[PDB]
Amino acid sequence: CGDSTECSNLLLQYGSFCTQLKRALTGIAVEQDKNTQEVFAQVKQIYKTPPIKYFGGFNFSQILPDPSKPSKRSPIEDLLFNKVTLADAGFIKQYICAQKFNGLTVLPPLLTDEMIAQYTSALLAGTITSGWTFGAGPALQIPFPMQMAYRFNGIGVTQNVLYENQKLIANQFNSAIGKIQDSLFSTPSALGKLQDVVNHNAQALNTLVKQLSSKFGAISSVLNDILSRLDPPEAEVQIDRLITGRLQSLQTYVTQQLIRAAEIRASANLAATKMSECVLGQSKRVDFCGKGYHLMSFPQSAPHGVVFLHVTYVPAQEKNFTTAPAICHDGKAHFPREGVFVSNGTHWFLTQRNFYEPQIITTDNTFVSGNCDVVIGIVN
Amino acid sequence: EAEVQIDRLITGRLQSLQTYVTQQLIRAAEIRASANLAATKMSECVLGQSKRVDFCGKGYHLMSFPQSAPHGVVFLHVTYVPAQEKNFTTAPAICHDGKAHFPREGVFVSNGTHWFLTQRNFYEPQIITTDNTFVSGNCDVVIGIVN
Amino acid sequence: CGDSTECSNLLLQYGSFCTQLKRALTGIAVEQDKNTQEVFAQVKQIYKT
Amino acid sequence: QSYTNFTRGVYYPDKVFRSSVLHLTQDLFLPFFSNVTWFHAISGTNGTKRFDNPVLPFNDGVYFASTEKSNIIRGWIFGTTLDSKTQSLLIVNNATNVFIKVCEFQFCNDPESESGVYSSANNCTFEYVSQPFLFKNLREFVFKNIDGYFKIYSKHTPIIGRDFPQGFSALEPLVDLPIGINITRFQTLLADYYVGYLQPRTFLLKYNENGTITDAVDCALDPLSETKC
Amino acid sequence: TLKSFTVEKGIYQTSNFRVQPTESIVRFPNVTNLCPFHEVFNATRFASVYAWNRTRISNCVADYSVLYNFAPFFAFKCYGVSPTKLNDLCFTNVYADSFVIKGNEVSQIAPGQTGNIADYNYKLPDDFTGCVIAWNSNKLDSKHSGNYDYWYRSLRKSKLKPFERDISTEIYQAGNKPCKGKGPNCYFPLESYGFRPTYGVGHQPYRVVVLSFELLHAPATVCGPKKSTNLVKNKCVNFNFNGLTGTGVLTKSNKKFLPFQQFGRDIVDTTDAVRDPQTLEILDITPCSFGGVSVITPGTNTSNQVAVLYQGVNCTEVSVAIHADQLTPTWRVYSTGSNVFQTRAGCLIGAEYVNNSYECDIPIGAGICASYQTSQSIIAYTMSLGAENSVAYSNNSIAIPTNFTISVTTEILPVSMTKTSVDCTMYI
Ligand SMILES: *[C@@H]1O[C@H](CO)[C@@H](O[C@@H]2O[C@H](CO)[C@@H](O[C@@H]3O[C@H](CO)[C@@H](O)[C@H](O)[C@@H]3O)[C@H](O)[C@H]2NC(C)=O)[C@H](O)[C@H]1NC(C)=O
Ligand SMILES: *[C@@H]1O[C@H](CO)[C@@H](O[C@@H]2O[C@H](CO)[C@@H](O[C@@H]3O[C@H](CO)[C@@H](O)[C@H](O)[C@@H]3O)[C@H](O)[C@H]2NC(C)=O)[C@H](O)[C@H]1NC(C)=O
Ligand SMILES: *[C@@H]1O[C@H](CO)[C@@H](O[C@@H]2O[C@H](CO)[C@@H](O[C@@H]3O[C@H](CO)[C@@H](O)[C@H](O)[C@@H]3O)[C@H](O)[C@H]2NC(C)=O)[C@H](O)[C@H]1NC(C)=O
Ligand SMILES: *[C@@H]1O[C@H](CO)[C@@H](O[C@@H]2O[C@H](CO)[C@@H](O)[C@H](O)[C@H]2NC(C)=O)[C@H](O)[C@H]1NC(C)=O
Ligand SMILES: *[C@@H]1O[C@H](CO)[C@@H](O[C@@H]2O[C@H](CO)[C@@H](O)[C@H](O)[C@H]2NC(C)=O)[C@H](O)[C@H]1NC(C)=O
Ligand SMILES: *[C@@H]1O[C@H](CO)[C@@H](O)[C@H](O)[C@H]1NC(C)=O
Ligand SMILES: *[C@@H]1O[C@H](CO)[C@@H](O)[C@H](O)[C@H]1NC(C)=O
Ligand SMILES: *[C@@H]1O[C@H](CO)[C@@H](O)[C@H](O)[C@H]1NC(C)=O
Ligand SMILES: *[C@@H]1O[C@H](CO)[C@@H](O)[C@H](O)[C@H]1NC(C)=O
Ligand SMILES: *[C@@H]1O[C@H](CO)[C@@H](O)[C@H](O)[C@H]1NC(C)=O
Ligand SMILES: *[C@@H]1O[C@H](CO)[C@@H](O)[C@H](O)[C@H]1NC(C)=O
Ligand SMILES: *[C@@H]1O[C@H](CO)[C@@H](O)[C@H](O)[C@H]1NC(C)=O
Ligand SMILES: *[C@@H]1O[C@H](CO)[C@@H](O)[C@H](O)[C@H]1NC(C)=O
Ligand SMILES: *[C@@H]1O[C@H](CO)[C@@H](O)[C@H](O)[C@H]1NC(C)=O
Ligand SMILES: *[C@@H]1O[C@H](CO)[C@@H](O)[C@H](O)[C@H]1NC(C)=O
């Protein structure tokens, strides 16, 4: 009933439909800020990296804030931002070329992109400097190669593998980060999950505005024309027809926004769970945070969402070995304490499950229980 | 004419019921999601010890206790929070007779005059011995090895 | 209102309703195929015993 | 005598200005790739020889185009009988002015300077005079008879572009004559040309930054066109 | 809004604001040629119903007071535009169908109706807009010997199409006999009704004129009288450009209209431009500023001071609307210097912006929160995210806990909600 008091007076006869629609949209608007806060505001303090960006040879320059460029965002965050900000009017900006100005107002988020970037930076500095300790109690500094050594223990790989191969691991990490940046740069569809959300909301508003042009059985869709051409007692009939059509269109908009809000809430809860378990800790849940054995994760912000970089350990270059469940020695059955017995065809060795590193089979690496007769397939 | 006026009232009341039921279905879905999370927390926090960070409260999870509440459940999460940290000098390995010694468990720390092995989550210095460490490789491979 | 021109002409006065329903049901159909693919197509190779 | 490849006949359907939009509208248009008759067999002096020049039907509306530099085509006659039993509309284009008249034209010049233009005009109902209309310039016209109005659209495209489908351009309305005339047939009046027929169709029309129509999709032509629409 | 005399601390959404118009602009064609209704209504003779006199009226000023001056009327029978207050509209096309009909068939002139006239002599569209205006002409058309210049086509092969007429007089054929000439039971079609001055009311002649009106905004006009005024640009006004009525801000347009075109439309089929009928200037129509209004309240148990956020607008326009007495809500705030702050969300009036950061209390948006602080007044600030804590990263330094705390935290989750059922029939 824009700028029409006869229509407004008729609209009042339908009861508290506006109260329910206003409250539903307000609840959605509040929920979106709750979702953003739950996903990103998980750190008690704003942590910062040291002045010297040396972490054992690991290069985080593409995920850490770039102090030179405005907004203090990482190269990857800036790429994600430039790639998905296809919304011309996603917030008021102190101000469809008309931006759906038919009583439909888009509200800004409570946390701006720079503040979200600051939360992401705090989480990244915390993870890089102190591993998972900052996510449980106070932040405890640890040298990065030692943090990685303990994460390797977390995935069942002995600490010496990292230290002996520290240069290899740092180079593979740096290469993987560069490849990720190039993949996101060269593949516009990679961020489709976030773009679809923007597109769906745009469609929801565009259709709603278009519904104003429908007649819904009236002689004319314009209230000024109805009032000009018809006397009040007939104008009220034509206006009630338009009120019914527009109100049904608003209820449809609100119902779909509530359903989409529920979907976004579920996604935000998943994002918060992933951040809590994979950024503030090391996860043992298979494929929860990337394919492979999980080592660590890094958050990056994005318009209307979060992008996680999951760093995992992937076994490579496997070799066939002959195995046995136990070794028979002096009538005793010897079992591995932490490993598998393997043979290269002439000699038996004990190795760790996730990385070939043959050891001499000794009484300090095995345990004895029972004799050689009970175990099936025991080898001398 | 009563037929027309009654049909208008029927339309209004029936539409009001459809609005109520649709909102109840959406709220029911929200409650179902919450109930599924509560049941998962009951299974993983109360019936066992969880390793999921911040799933069962802040800090390292020890145990949880359920309490009922009207229309819901309240969990009391008991966690271990480190406190009063001290900053020690560390090293990835100790070099002795040319062998590179790594901890089996724990981290090497130093008070400035002596090196000890301590459990990661609680300062408790131990003497570094061949029972606490393992040997792999030699002193020329590990970066930052100390004698 | 199947096979009726007059009702189609009146139906066009209610806007894009049919288009919104087509989008909603198509989105559901795609989502159901996404759900099946996400649950079962978790392996990149077909392994045999 | 029949040219199949016609993609032209789009015109501005209303007085609404649009900019940088694709607008879906339902109106009478020449369908894309509709069979269009090319009257080269019976063209000018050596075609009609003061004979033939057949009268064509007028189904809803027609598309007309001329490629004759000498302007042998001077006008059009519209009506149902054209022997004074019913009213007929004449739109002859003189070098000085275009003279549009509705009268009972029992006689006409239709059975090389100073050709006859005689007509009897036994009883007249409408008269109108407008600016003159008068190879390097192809002259497209659309003539439709809707609800008592004879709507004439045209474009004297300067296109030297001898190939008939040289490019796409939308026609602009030229005149809207308030004539309550029943039109079922028409004839081309000579002192070559193409005639196509309009059908109800839905088109997606592309309006550029200046509001000029630059392209169009015929929504019934192909599954791809339906997808685009 | 909250239906309470006690308001909790927070920001609440209230009604929206609009900038009200200050002027009324009528821009009708500068035409002084009166439409020839007098020559049609006050005609010497009307045509027979068989071939009604269809007069096209255009390029003139409509004036319907001529009709009230002409005579009291039997009926106006206005459809689509029901009132007789037609002087406020601009019509694209006007047609006057003039005929003399007998009284017992006047009721047959409705858009949908049966009888020999409705079916075979004059047919209106069933969705027709216009007026069928009747006058008693017994004193003019009736003759003592009978006026035989009128007839009806009561015998016809098929139904008459709306506003389409084939006036051939060929004798109706029936049966398998040609019926060429008189003698067979096929009779000549016209009725020959004779209007006599001694006939009762149902048989007297009536002069009926059907005014067919095409209302399509105003691509062409036959406008009624109004006193036009001058254009005022860059202000919110109520404008009427021919029959196009609306409210907005008129500015110079940068669109390139064809000479043909008069109006513009946006992607949502809303008017966004109009050609001025007296100057042919193309104008842009911008909606008058509007947006949500929210009130930031510390809570009525602390202070009754509130701040108002005008969402979606620049404080320059809010200040102008307040000074001009244009803002829709009639309440005002002090709006003094240092109490007006521009946020991304909108114009915040009633809070002093400070350069200190605090934890967010009452959220406003885009980073600006507000609170009630010291003497005490509402302040606005950029929210703090947390304390800073640089961590002493080093190549060879590790922090090891020496003590610990056993912490207990509380997490609350809904499990169920009230179970309801509704008796649909009893409720409705
Ligand atoms: C961490 O990695 C980034 C790259 O991922 C390093 O920045 C890169 O530094 C090299 C230095 O050679 C830059 O090379 C430049 O090449 C152009 C020609 O292509 C030349 O004109 C320049 O003078 C320079 O040699 C490279 O562009 C630059 N890339 C980026 C994205 O900054 C960074 O130095 C690494 N940090 C550490 C501590 O290793
Ligand atoms: C399975 O693994 C065992 C252990 O690695 C292999 O036996 C070992 O083979 C190496 C080959 O270089 C022997 O090295 C020897 O070193 C002395 C140093 O003086 C040199 O003189 C010899 O010529 C030779 O290079 C090593 O002694 C030997 N160890 C034993 C216990 O036999 C074995 O060959 C592997 N089998 C397969 C099938 O891979
Ligand atoms: C780093 O830790 C080591 C061992 O925890 C410290 O060395 C120890 O220092 C204590 C003094 O606080 C010595 O106690 C002394 O024991 C002799 C035993 O005869 C007694 O006579 C003295 O009166 C005193 O009680 C202890 O012997 C000594 N142990 C060793 C192996 O040196 C070291 O001082 C610590 N350094 C720093 C900087 O904290
Ligand atoms: C491992 O060594 C033992 C002997 O130390 C083998 O046991 C002998 O197996 C032979 C098989 O013919 C018997 O005849 C002997 O009497 C067994 N002796 C004893 C003491 O048990 C055993 O078979 C060896 N296993 C393998 C896999 O070679
Ligand atoms: C640990 O001790 C070894 C010797 O036991 C040191 O090795 C010597 O290092 C110096 C240079 O610092 C060389 O000039 C000698 O030739 C090396 N000798 C041997 C036998 O390797 C080693 O540098 C010591 N490490 C530290 C950190 O002090
Ligand atoms: C508000 O309007 C004034 C008009 O002069 C303009 O100068 C100013 O930049 C505008 N501010 C914003 C935030 O748009
Ligand atoms: C070695 O491993 C590969 C793994 O694909 C397998 O195909 C091959 O048959 C194996 N060979 C032996 C001798 O076990
Ligand atoms: C680390 O320990 C040194 C002494 O070894 C001390 O001077 C420094 O302040 C400590 N740093 C922190 C952050 O506690
Ligand atoms: C297609 O168009 C060309 C002109 O570009 C014409 O020469 C040719 O004969 C046409 N083909 C037909 C009519 O099938
Ligand atoms: C509109 O037409 C003019 C004609 O000179 C042209 O220069 C201008 O670029 C056109 N508009 C756009 C947006 O290209
Ligand atoms: C108008 O009608 C009156 C009769 O009511 C007649 O006397 C007068 O001459 C008429 N004037 C005209 C047709 O100009
Ligand atoms: C209709 O009546 C008017 C009255 O002035 C006359 O001028 C006009 O010629 C008439 N037309 C017909 C078709 O009778
Ligand atoms: C128009 O002309 C056609 C020619 O066949 C005729 O059948 C039709 O009845 C005519 N209609 C009118 C209203 O004259
Ligand atoms: C009347 O309007 C026309 C519109 O083109 C204008 O040219 C003419 O000057 C106007 N005359 C007066 C007296 O306003
Ligand atoms: C760690 O060692 C490298 C060796 O080049 C040095 O550049 C870096 O500054 C050291 N880190 C600190 C915190 O001193």
Author numbering:
A (entry chain A): 743 to 837, 850 to 1134
B (entry chain C): 988 to 1134
C (entry chain B): 743 to 791
D (entry chain A): 26 to 30, 32 to 65, 68 to 139, 154 to 176, 186 to 210, 212 to 243, 264 to 301
E (entry chain C): 302 to 482, 484 to 676, 689 to 742
Provide passages from the article that reported this PDB entry.
The JN.1-sublineage KP.3.1.1 recently emerged as the globally prevalent SARS-CoV-2 variant, demonstrating increased infectivity and antibody escape. We investigate how mutations and a deletion in the KP.3.1.1 spike protein (S) affect hACE2 binding and antibody escape. To investigate the effects of N30 glycosylation introduced by S31Δ and two RBD mutations (F456L and Q493E) on the structure and function of the spike protein, we determined the cryo-EM structures of the recent SARS-CoV-2 variants KP.3.1.1 and JN.1.11 along with engineered variants JN.1.11 + S31Δ+Q493E, JN.1.11.1 + S31Δ, and JN.1.11 + S31Δ. The spike proteins exhibited three conformational states: “one RBD up,” “all RBD down,” and “flexible” (i.e., one or two RBDs disordered in the density maps due to flexibility).
KP.3.1.1 contains only one additional change compared to KP.3, a deletion in the NTD (S31Δ). Compared to the JN.1 spike protein, KP.3 carries two mutations in the RBD (F456L and Q493E) and one mutation in the S2 domain (V1104L). S (S31) and KP.3.1.1 S (S31Δ) in both “one RBD up” and “all RBD down” states revealed similar overall conformations and no change in intra-domain distances (Cα RMSD = 1.1 Å and 0.9 Å, respectively), indicating that S31Δ and N30 glycosylation did not induce any substantial conformational changes. In the cryo-EM structure of the spike protein of KP.3.1.1, we observed N30 glycosylation and a 180° flip of the F32 side chain, resulting from the S31 deletion in the 30NSFT33 motif. CryoSPARC 3D variability analysis demonstrated that all spike proteins had similar proportions of up and down RBDs, suggesting that S31Δ does not influence the conformational dynamics of the spike protein. The S31 deletion and N30 glycosylation exhibited a minimal effect on the spike protein conformation and did not affect spike binding to hACE2 or to the broadly neutralizing antibody BD55-1205.19 However, addition of N-glycans at N30 knocked out the binding of the NTD antibody C1717 and altered the glycoforms at a spatially adjacent N-glycosylation site at residue N61. Our results demonstrated that S31Δ indeed induces a fully glycan-occupied N30 glycosylation site in all of the variants carrying the S31 deletion, including JN.1.11 + S31Δ, JN.1.11.1 + S31Δ, JN.1.11 + Q493E + S31Δ, and KP.3.1.1. The N30 site (NxT motif) was found to be predominantly occupied with high-mannose glycans. Structural alignment of SARS-CoV-2 WT, JN.1, and JN.1.11 spike proteins with KP.3.1.1 showed that the NTD and RBD exhibited greater rootmean-square deviations (RMSDs) than S2. V1104L has little effect on any conformational changes; V1104 and L1104 are both surrounded by a conserved hydrophobic pocket formed by P1090, F1095, I1115, and T1120 in the same protomer.
